[PDB]
Amino acid sequence: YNHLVIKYYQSFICNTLIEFNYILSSFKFIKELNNIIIISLNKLF
Amino acid sequence: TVFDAELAFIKEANEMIQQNTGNLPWDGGKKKIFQGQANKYLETPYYLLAALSGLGLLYFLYSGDAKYKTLVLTPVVGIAAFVLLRRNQILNRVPTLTELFLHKDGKFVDAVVSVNGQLISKNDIPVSTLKLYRGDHTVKVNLNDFEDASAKKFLAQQSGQEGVINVHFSKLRNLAARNGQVLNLGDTEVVVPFENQANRIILKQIFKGVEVLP
Amino acid sequence: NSLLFTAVSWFSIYQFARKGAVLPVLREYGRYFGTHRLFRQYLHTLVLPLLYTEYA
Amino acid sequence: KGFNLANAVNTVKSTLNAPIKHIKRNIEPTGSNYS
Amino acid sequence: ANFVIPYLKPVADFWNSLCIDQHQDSLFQFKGQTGSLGTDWTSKYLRSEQDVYNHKYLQYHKRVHEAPELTDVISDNVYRLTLFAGVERVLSVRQAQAILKTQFAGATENISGAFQTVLNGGIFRRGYFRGALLNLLQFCGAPYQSLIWSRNSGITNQVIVSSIFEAFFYPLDTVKTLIYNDVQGKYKGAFHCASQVVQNAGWSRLYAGIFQKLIFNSALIFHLNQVWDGSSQQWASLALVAAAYPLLVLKTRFQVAGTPLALATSNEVLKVNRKTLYAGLVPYLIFNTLFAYEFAAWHSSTAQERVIGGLQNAMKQFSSPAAEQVWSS
Amino acid sequence: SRIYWFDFNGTVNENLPLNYNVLKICRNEINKLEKLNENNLGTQKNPIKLNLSFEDKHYNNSKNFISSIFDKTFESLNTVLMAPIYSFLEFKLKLSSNHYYVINGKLYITYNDSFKLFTTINDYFNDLNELSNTKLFFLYRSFNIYNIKLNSLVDFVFLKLILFIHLLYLKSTNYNRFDYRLKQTDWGFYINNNSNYIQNIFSGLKYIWRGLRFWII
Amino acid sequence: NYLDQPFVKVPNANPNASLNFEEGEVLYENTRLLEWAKFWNYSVVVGYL
Amino acid sequence: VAIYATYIALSYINNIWKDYVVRAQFSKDKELLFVTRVSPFGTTEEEVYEVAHLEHLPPSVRSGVKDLSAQDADGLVDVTCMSSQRSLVFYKGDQYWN
Amino acid sequence: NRTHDKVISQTYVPAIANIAFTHLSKKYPQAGLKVDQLNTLKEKTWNDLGVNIEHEKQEILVELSEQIFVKESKLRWVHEQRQRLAHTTYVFSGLEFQNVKVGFFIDSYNFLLQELAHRSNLYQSKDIVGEKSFHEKHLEQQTAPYSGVKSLEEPVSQNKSFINSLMRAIHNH
Amino acid sequence: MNNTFKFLHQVISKLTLKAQVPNYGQYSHSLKRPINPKVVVFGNSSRAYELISSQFRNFNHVNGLELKGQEDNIQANKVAQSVLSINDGFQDGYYITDFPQNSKQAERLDLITDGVNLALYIKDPSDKVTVTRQQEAIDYYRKTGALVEFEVDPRGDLEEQVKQLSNQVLNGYKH
């Protein structure tokens, strides 16, 4: 979450100085892996 | 005449002493009142290590010649390398103020800011707009989240959840301005490095919003 | 052995004379030709070992 | 500005005189009288 | 035996290979006969003790006649490249020391000063072994290819081929010299240093002292050829190399001149004090005399005759001193 | 062994050694005076009048490179060819082959482009040694103060670990099982711990190392 | 049993509460001894081996 | 033989170096002396002494005062901690002292 | 309960506490944040005091950097304060102090300050002159001027001979 | 920060300090002196003058008594311009006499020059003007920690006093 916020802030600053590809470079992979591990835990691991 | 290395080094040392104290003359109406340095972090070795770990895991899936210790160490090394790569990518794109020149009239400043090694120049910034933050501030995501549904939900869940979300800079200091202070240049906020050679009197005057007399 | 002794003696005389430490073995400025103690010490440390070697 | 035999001899003398204090301290009689 | 010996035993095997006569040991491994006499332990020992000089002769024959191999040349000059590779950096720093600011960081203007400047960084990539891989690459490039393209050639053809190849590979020499002299470690590598030089001074700045290097290489090749032949002109060649050494010093100073590594710009390299022209003459001569280049391909007829005659004379010991002179034999 | 007197009209403080720039001005004045004597200026009763202010005393191209390397190659060949000849000529000149000025009431020696106070030969050698020490370690003493990045990391890491320990014993009581066991015994030589154990945490590893220290090798 | 002295008390394991262990002025410092120590120790060990 | 010879060598090498003082720093009230000494493997180990128990004892043999290290200008000064009968060996050179 | 380990110098702990508590009282009045109550405040966390130290951490660091002068440091107070600000900003930005006691925060800042002071002296005492190393003694000896044979450079006519001139040249270079 | 990790922390910190200052262990005694020593001397007496002459023999003199009656910013600027250069004789050391007379001048000089490397107080009871005219400057330099007070007996031994002053000045320099 902090990485996403910081990337958004840096992208906004760079755009103002003169986009979301860098912000969301690997969000899906991390989110899917974390959700899979949470599901495995919910399976009483 | 013959070359004298001692006098050449005396001249070089005098120049270095003048630069360290921040004392620079007026050359062409722009007085260099600030010089900074931007940290450069490695990304290619970590990306290569992460890719190698992924390919090794895939190969060990293809061929069952993988030890238990190998199957344990490879994902750990890959995850660590990927985390370090992401951290270095975030740290490299930090916009750091590298050079700052003062106008002759003492009311505008020309800023050269480094973003991932790219130098961006702003040649008109009123001194009254400058504000050095002597402490953490709050960043705002004004465009809701302005992204896909999944990312928007993720950013909304761990935040104010109501439109514009405000995040205190304390949660982001270790990756955005860990090696400097946030300076609002009217429109944009850059990171002035702690390692810097600047004209301390003029820098103190301008960074509080106070203009410098011609 | 004589050449090693001569080399060591010449090296010592040169290195110590560079700092002004000249061993007071002979008279300063000779007697007939006015040669200096440094030159006569070099000559002796070159010749006398050879004479002793030949005699032995 | 180079090798010099006087400095070498001084260093050799310093090297030889360095362990004197520790040997003397080892030989020193303590304030102990083990009757 | 299951956890330590599998790792300790290879080290002991390597130690024995470095210590024990490998050809003789391998000969002793095949004990037995298959219909021929002279395959017992005694005959094998005798031929193995005669096989040392024969193997030396065969290696020299391969170096002289057959096409040169990189491994053979490297092993022939292993001490210059592996262990005393930092002495090359020391000599380069000594040559460039007159304009190198090393006098202002805990060092003097002598060979001890250059040694301490090199060794202050450490014993590795930032210190003694800085540029050692670049030195190995330069050796694989210029002298090895010169040997390849002029195998059995006269001194003039050797000089011509060597000059052509040193001209072709000179930017690597400039990069290596710049990497030798950065006491503060400004350059992170060969590519980084070359990129900085090209960006700040252009491509033509990589050829600062190419002509001085070529002339000094001609002199050095003549000296090496006179040394290999064993002629009495070794002292004349040493005098010639001593005379040509200021060319090498000027080459190093021109290479490091315009960079921030040096106090003097290029136009000021010829303004340096004349007494500093022979910056590292005696250390350079001592180092080359001890570990000189051994290019057995370039050996002339006299050098080949000398080496082979030495081996043949060494082969005369395999007879009984008290051998009766018999009427019928 | 010249003698000169300078009258500064009180502009230059005479209770402290003369500045390098003041002595340089005096040396230039003497050099101008010695070329053509000016009424024997510099006598005790006829001093030289100098009004030295604060500022006076204290304030003071591939083709091109190809042509350049060719010309410098020719000049380098000339220098190499002439170097032994120049050395021999200089040596023959050596074979073929004052500095004290009494400025006011003190003795000075001609040093560099100015004068230097000269009291004893030992003090002169000490001044030479101090100047050599100043020149010799200039780059060592001018190190980067803000090169602490790595150092910072070290500190941070340890504090991080310590922080975790503080997060592990936030609501943890002082007493252990042995404390109640001791409270049940008549062992007056042992007392019960009354403070937090975060300061001395993981000391058993230290004592384990000390126990096996001489036995590992 | 042996620490249970019948006539006197054994010293307390902890230092006296009156004592203050805060750092003060440095009196003597010869750090190079450590290096010498290392040297000699290592030398002996190597020689011993 | 290997185990005990190595143990004896290391232990007695450490014992020889255990007298010397690498560093000595007072407490704030100057009631304690923190003495850094040589560890078995060459690094630091810290001890604490009470300054009240430290004494520069004269030799038991009165004729041996001549044969002391402290007679020299650069010798050694042995100060006995009497509450533990330990030795603190200082270099009596002014450059090592505050 | 207590070991024989020296405690870090508490010279600047009252100053650090005073500056931090003055700033926090400017921000959080009626929190009972006084340097006189330092012991009781040390034994309590920031949540108990109702203080969000995370928000005030950077301002506290800047004020501590500005308003504390460390005399036992071989860095000039400008450079010393700037380096301390950088180092403490890095370290404290890495850390999280909300769930721990006030004593940990103050002791950690004092530890960083004293460690920077120690490093500025290269881990040697500022008050001890020390002995020159092998390199320093070697360089001191090697830069000593060479005073050659002074008897050769005399106005005596005996020094005008070729042999005397040769010896004079080769010795007094 | 605690007792257990102290040894590991100090070992690693000693190892990592070589990154910033290479070979600090072998040159520590040589690093006690800064590159450009700016000294501010307060003692104004006969014995004080003898100590200044003996100690700062190779340093240059900046007579701040001339800068009288200016704006307390012109004086500091001029003094800073006088102490931020190296002579052709490689004399990078300067000592300034009677310049700082109040806190403002000292603050300005420290801001321009990033602070003076040493402030020295001879503390001779035989002089009267030093406490009357530079007490604010002495208090300021004691506040910043750059002040070294070397108590001097005017009837004491000059050689012992100069040796003690040399040691104290060498140990009192700031980078």
Coordinates of C-alpha atoms in Angstrom, one line a residue, chain D residues 17-18 20-34, chain H residues 19-20 58-60 64 67-70 72 74 76 78 87 89 91:
Chain D
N17 CA 64.8 -1.6 21.9
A18 CA 61.0 -2.1 21.7
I20 CA 63.0 -4.3 26.4
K21 CA 60.2 -2.8 28.5
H22 CA 58.1 -5.9 28.4
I23 CA 61.0 -8.3 29.3
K24 CA 61.9 -6.0 32.2
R25 CA 58.3 -5.9 33.4
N26 CA 58.2 -9.7 33.3
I27 CA 61.5 -9.9 35.3
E28 CA 60.2 -7.3 37.8
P29 CA 59.6 -8.4 41.4
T30 CA 56.1 -7.8 42.4
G31 CA 54.9 -6.4 45.8
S32 CA 54.4 -10.1 46.8
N33 CA 56.5 -12.1 49.2
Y34 CA 55.3 -15.7 48.9
Chain H
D19 CA 47.7 -7.7 32.4
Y20 CA 48.0 -5.0 29.7
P58 CA 56.5 -1.0 45.6
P59 CA 58.4 -4.2 45.0
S60 CA 58.7 -6.8 47.8
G64 CA 64.8 -4.7 42.6
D67 CA 65.5 -3.3 37.7
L68 CA 62.0 -2.0 37.0
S69 CA 60.4 -1.0 33.7
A70 CA 59.1 2.3 35.3
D72 CA 62.7 4.2 31.9
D74 CA 58.9 4.9 28.1
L76 CA 55.6 0.2 32.0
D78 CA 52.0 -1.9 36.9
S87 CA 47.4 -6.1 37.3
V89 CA 49.9 -2.4 32.9
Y91 CA 52.5 2.7 29.1

